[PDB]
Amino acid sequence: STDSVVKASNWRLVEVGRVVLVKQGQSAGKLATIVEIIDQKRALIDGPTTGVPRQAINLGQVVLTPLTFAVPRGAKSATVSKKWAAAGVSEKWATSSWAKKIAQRERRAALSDFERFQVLVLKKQKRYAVKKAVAK
Amino acid sequence: MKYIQTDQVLDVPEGVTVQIRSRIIKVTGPRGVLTKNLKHIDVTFTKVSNRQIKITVHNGDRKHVAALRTVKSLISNLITGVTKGYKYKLRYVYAHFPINVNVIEKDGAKFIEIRNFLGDKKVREVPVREGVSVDFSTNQKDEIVLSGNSVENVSQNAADIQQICRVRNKDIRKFLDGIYVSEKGLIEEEE
Amino acid sequence: RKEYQVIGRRLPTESVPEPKLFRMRIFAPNDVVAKSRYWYFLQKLHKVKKASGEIVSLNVIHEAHPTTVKNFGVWVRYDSRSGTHNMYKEIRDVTRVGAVESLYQDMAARHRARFRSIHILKVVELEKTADVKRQYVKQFLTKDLKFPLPHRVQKTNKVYAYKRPSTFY
Amino acid sequence: EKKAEYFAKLREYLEEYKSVFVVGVDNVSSQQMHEVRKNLRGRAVVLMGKNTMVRRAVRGFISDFPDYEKLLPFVKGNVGFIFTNDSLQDIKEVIIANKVAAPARAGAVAPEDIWVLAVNTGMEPGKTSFFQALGVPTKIARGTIEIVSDVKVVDAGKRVGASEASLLNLLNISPFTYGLTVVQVYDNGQVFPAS
Amino acid sequence: YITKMTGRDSFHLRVRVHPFHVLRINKMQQGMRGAWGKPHGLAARVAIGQVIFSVRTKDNNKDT
RNA sequence: GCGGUUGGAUAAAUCCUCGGGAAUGUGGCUCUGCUUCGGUAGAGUGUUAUAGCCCGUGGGAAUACAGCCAGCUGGGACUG
RNA sequence: GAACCGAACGUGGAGUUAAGGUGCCGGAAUACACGCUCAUCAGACACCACAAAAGGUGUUAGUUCAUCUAGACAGCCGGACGGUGGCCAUGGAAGUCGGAAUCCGCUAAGGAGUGUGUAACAACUCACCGGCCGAAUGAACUAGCCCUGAAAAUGGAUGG
RNA sequence: AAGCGUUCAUAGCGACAUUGCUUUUUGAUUCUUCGAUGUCGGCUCUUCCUAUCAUACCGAAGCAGAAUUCGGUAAGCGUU
């Protein structure tokens, strides 16, 4: 080589200033920061812009995203909202492949029966063009 | 209480290297190469500054953190072996009957053979393991030395010579005979 | 779990009007249990009982700052099979009522101590990272704490799956 | 309690007497250190120390005394103070010339080159096995045990054992008579190498 | 044991319980006809939180 | 699944205002140096500065928990 | 399972619970939350079909006391005398068969001495203090779950 | 674990106390059977238990060797 070589590893670290998605409860499918850590299966969270109050919660009920930014250790609510907007965490979230596939099935759920009939006709037109091109 | 994170730091010499994916550790150096599969442990490695590795555990226990420190010792012995090499000496304490030792070949296997041990007619036979040379000592008589890279294979081979020269049905404090280990260390001197 | 205040008195008997009043910070599920536990602890101090006395006030004591992490230090007396022993545990919880709740779980887990055989002596919120003695709390009071969560698992409402799932995180 | 006395008493020197004359004293082996101080009893005062590197670093401050900055680097290995302002030359003659000596070695690095001579030892037959076991050839020419032909037993390098030390301490000197040697000399200030 | 360690005049042992309770036994014509037992031996009856042995000593000893 | 009210420290906090307090001490400056001199990482100093926390004084609301409505709307079963 | 727990009964329909349960057999959460245990004999729910004294650095929590800016424990080396064979005892007792004394010096520190060893010395070794190294360690106890203690006859039973 | 064992509590033993297990001894009791379950041993034949006398392989000794003593995993195999 001759300089070593280790693979090595890559995890999502739980920390102060780690934005997370909420699975269940009154929130469900929102976003919030981690303000300060308590212990192992326990953490404080807040995200007043997206709409979620201040609460202690299990890390099993929440889930870590791959997005982070600088926050003071153990901040309040209004100070987090100042940093939230400046970094542009909401805009970075929408462009991700996770959020687009989340937003896709929400649109699929709200389809009317007339709209579903158009998906038959438009998709049949694509198949004819693709099948002709692949043959050559 | 479960330790939230514990870690130990390896220090690699100049010439040697280490190649780690999953838990397979191919060490190479001046003398040769060695390998070891640690696929029963759940640790994680991190390269820092070429000649420095950090082994660590995340949320262990009392029993799990014991295996953290032992892996530091296991990998260090491969680096110590591949740089210098280990050397285990042996002596045969004989009282009445003089013990003979030879190395006769058979299908490229190489067996260490022992005869006339405590007046026995049965010719005894201990095999030589992979990657360890058997040699006789000049100047010092009544001696045999085992040398190689792997500390595990050399020490095991030296033990099998000792434990196939036991006395049976006698009082062992009286009949003080066998092939005992005198010294165990390194090949390269001044270290 | 709430954190009631129970102010008793004793009766206004003829000869000695105006008794001295006595206050306690009782933990209980509801108002009926709070008055029961008041007379229990008062009976181990003065010559009183439910017949010879009355409750003056019952107030709930909510937490001042319930959205902030605090390091509590609780003193406890508890009765084992053989005898009775004193202890001093330490908890890292968001409220007093939340901290006392988690103590009753920990005593029942390790020592097999039930609700009936646990006396809560005194609960104190500690100030400085220095007063805390225990190592299992002091792990989480360090400078720039970070750690991953290895070996994540999913939870399907469905039975069957067609992927061979991963535990990456 | 005890460190407080050693904190206070170390400030008294070099605040008179003002020639510190330090020496180890590491492998002694004494016995006769006891007497080196008791021959120094009339004039000098001795004080061996532990980790007082933090002490002499803190005592380097003071304000009215910045002369103790020279004493904090040299203390490596077993070292201790023998402060006394007689001169520096006269005390050097008393301590070094006295020395420790005394036998000998029982399982460590060897002395100077040992070399046993011929001619009778002064022993009737008994332990001729132990002489031949450690190299030395013997021949009983009438009665007592006599050694024939001179050969070196142990050279300066390889270790000396416990059993072989039995006859050396009684009969044949190694020699491993090792004495104390001075490290530094002071008289201001003044970093004197002493030679 | 205490005499071996320190000395015979380094303490004062005191037993604070006396056997007054007489036991009975039915040793064996018939079987269990007229089965009133006869005196066997003595014993002492003890409650919870009651002292059996008492020893006063100096502060130096204790461990012996 | 929504609405209207009553009580509590006329909820407690957040937020606003007037004080005090320090550290798992931000910025600066100090300082060993380390440098691709780009920048760097460690110790050190000291009270908000180009991060911000903790505790209370004063002010005005929402919300949660608990109660009540001779409040409002929908779906399903059995019986004649 | 005569007796225990819950409930007392005309014939049918709809709702709701008692005691007891909710991996499957079996109707009902492979629910939610915090711990503890790994047993080459694990354990599993009242009456009910058994287990004790005594022990374990297996692991978990706790009580009382000690040393800590060089910890001290490590753990590898350096010292372990001077008065001195202390008085006594008697073949001989020199720190070490014993009967009481228990004091100083130099002191970094060295008991008129922890043992080994000798006819008694010699020789070795600890107690106490340094040298190397740089942040928590040492002693005595209390109770949780596991293990040793725990051996019977056809093949076998937390209901499986 | 007081003593025995030349010396030395535990190689092998073990007073004074004290916790157990077992149903191959014998008592205690009278639930089953008196409109009947053919009651002592020996002969013959099968299988099960281990609290192991022998054989296989090991540890301890006041085990020099031979012989013997105490214990371990063992009911495979044999016991006139």
One-letter amino acid at E31 equals G
Continuous segment of H or E residues that includes residue A63: strand A62-68
- Answer yes or no: is C141 CB < 7 A from strand F: yes
Q: How far is the CA of D37 from the C1' of G103 (A)?
A: 21
Distance CA D112, CA B161 (A): 40
Quick check: do D and B touch, 3+ CB pairs under 8 A?
no
Among C63, C68, C132, C137, pick the best mutation site for testing chain A contact (most A Cβ within 10 A). C68
B5 cis-preceded (ω within 30 degrees of 0): no
Q: C69 CB near a chain A CB, below 8 Å?
A: yes
- What φ, ψ does residue C117 adopt, rounded to 5°? -110, 40
Taking the CA atoms of residue D40, residue D44, residue D50 and residue D52 in that order, the dihedral angle to the nearest 10 degrees is: -170
B1, B5, B58 member nearest C135 (Cβ) = B1
Q: What Å distances lie between residue A11 and A88, B10, E50, CA to CA?
A: 23, 22, 63
Distance CA D79, CA D22 (A): 7
Closest CA to C149 of A34, D14, D132: A34
Distance CA C49, CA C55 (A): 11
Give every CB contact of residue C8 below 8 A, 6+ residues apart in sequence. C21, C22, C38, C39, C42, C48, C53, C54, C55, C56
Nearest CA in chain B to A1: B17
Nucleotides of G under 7 A from a protein CB: 31-36, 58-64, 69-71, 77-82, 105-110, 123-125, 129-132, 134, 142-145
Nearest CA in chain C to A43: C69
Contacts of A11 in chain C (CB under 8 A): 148-150, 169
b/e burial code for range B97-126 (CB count within 10 A of at least 16 → b): eebebeeeeeeeeebbebeebbeeeeeeeb
By C1' distance from the Cα of C65, the closest nucleotide is F13
Taking the CA atoms of residue B155, residue B156, residue B158 and residue B161 in that order, the dihedral angle to the nearest 10 degrees is: 170
C135, C139, C150 member nearest B58 (Cβ) = C150
Tokens for D32, please give them: 């006769």
Contacts of A9 in chain B (CB under 8 A): 44-46
Contacts of B59 in chain A (CB under 8 A): 40
To one decimal place, what's the resolution in Å? 3.6
- Only one residue has tokens 């850590």, namely A37
Distance CA B168, CA A91 (A): 82
Query: Distance from B10 to chain C by nearest Cα, in Å?
Result: 21
Among C67, C68, C137, C147, pick the best mutation site for testing chain A contact (most A Cβ within 10 A). C67
Return the SS3 of A131: helix
Tokens for C55, please give them: 């409750």
> Could you report how far apart the first and last alpha carbons of chain C are, in Å?
36
- What φ, ψ does residue E36 adopt, rounded to 5°? -65, 120
Cα C154 off chain centre by = 34
Distance CA B158, CA B176 (A): 18
Q: C140 CB near a chain B CB, below 8 Å?
A: yes
Q: What Å distances lie between residue A77 and A49, A65, A88, A124, CA to CA?
A: 10, 21, 17, 52
Work out whether the CA dihedral A98, A100, A103, A108 comes out positive or negative: negative
Closest CA to C118 of C89, C82, C76, C154: C76
- Answer yes or no: is B174 CB < 7 A from strand H: yes
A38, A44, A59 member nearest C149 (Cβ) = A59
Q: What Å distances lie between residue D192 and A13, D69, D74, CA to CA?
A: 60, 15, 12
- Answer yes or no: is D45 CB < 7 A from strand G: yes
Contacts of C139 in chain B (CB under 8 A): 3-4
B1, B3, B58 member nearest C148 (Cβ) = B58
Q: A114 CB near a chain C CB, below 8 Å?
A: no
Distance CA A60, CA A64 (A): 10
Return the SS3 of E42: strand
CB contact under 8 A, B47 and A1: no
CB contact under 8 A, C139 and B3: yes
Minimum-distance residue to G80 (CA–C1'): D31
Q: Are strands B44-47 and B133-135 parallel, antiparallel or unpaired?
A: unpaired
Does residue B7 contact residue B60 with C-beta atoms inside 8 Å?
Answer: no
Distance CA D152, CA D170 (A): 18
Subunits close to A (at least 3 CB pairs below 8 A): B, C
Catalogue the long-range contacts made by D28-36 (C-beta closer than 8 Å, 24 or more residues apart).
Answer: D28/D100, D28/D180, D29/D100, D29/D102, D29/D178, D30/D100, D30/D102, D31/D100, D31/D102, D32/D98, D32/D99, D32/D100, D32/D101, D32/D102, D33/D100, D33/D180, D35/D98, D36/D95, D36/D98, D36/D180
- Answer yes or no: is C114 CB < 7 A from strand F: no
b/e burial code for range A109-121 (CB count within 10 A of at least 16 → b): eeeeeeeeeeeee
Q: How far is the CA of A28 from the C1' of F67 (A)?
A: 31
Does residue D167 contact residue D82 with C-beta atoms inside 8 Å?
Answer: no
Q: How far is the CA of E43 from the C1' of G54 (A)?
A: 25
Continuous segment of H or E residues that includes residue E21: strand E21-25
Distance CA C147, CA C84 (A): 40
Q: What Å distances lie between residue C167 and C152, C154, E59, CA to CA?
A: 5, 8, 64
CB contact under 8 A, C150 and A38: no
Which residues of chain B have a Cβ shorter than 8 Å from any chain C Cβ?
1, 3-5, 58-59
What would the DSSP string read from start to end of chain B?
---SEEEEEE---SS-EEEEETTEEEEE-SS-EE--B--SS--EEEE-SSS-EEEEEES--HHHHHHHHHHHHHHHHHHHHHHT-EEEEEEEE-SSSPPEEEEE-STT--EEEEE-GGG--SPEEEEPPSS-EEE--SSS-S-EEEEES-HHHHHHHHHHHHTTS---SS-TTTS--EEEEEEEEESSS--
Closest CA to C122 of C13, C24, C10: C24
Nearest CA in chain B to C150: B58
Distance CA D74, CA D23 (A): 11
Does residue A8 contact residue A28 with C-beta atoms inside 8 Å?
Answer: no
Classify residue D113 by its DSSP letter.
P
Closest CA to B80 of B153, B157, B190, B185: B185
The experimental technique behind this entry is cryo-EM
Per the rule left: phi > 0, alpha: psi between -120 and 50, beta: everything else, D51 is: beta
Among C91, C139, C144, pick the best mutation site for testing chain B contact (most B Cβ within 10 A). C139
Taking the CA atoms of residue A99, residue A100, residue A104 and residue A110 in that order, the dihedral angle to the nearest 10 degrees is: 60
Distance CA C150, CA C168 (A): 8
By C1' distance from the Cα of C64, the closest nucleotide is F12
- Answer yes or no: is B164 CB < 7 A from strand H: no
One-letter amino acid at B38 equals L
Residue A102, classified by CB atoms within 10 Å of its CB into exposed (0-12), middle (13-18) or buried (19+), is: middle
Return the SS3 of D23: strand
- Only one residue has tokens 């890292």, namely C92
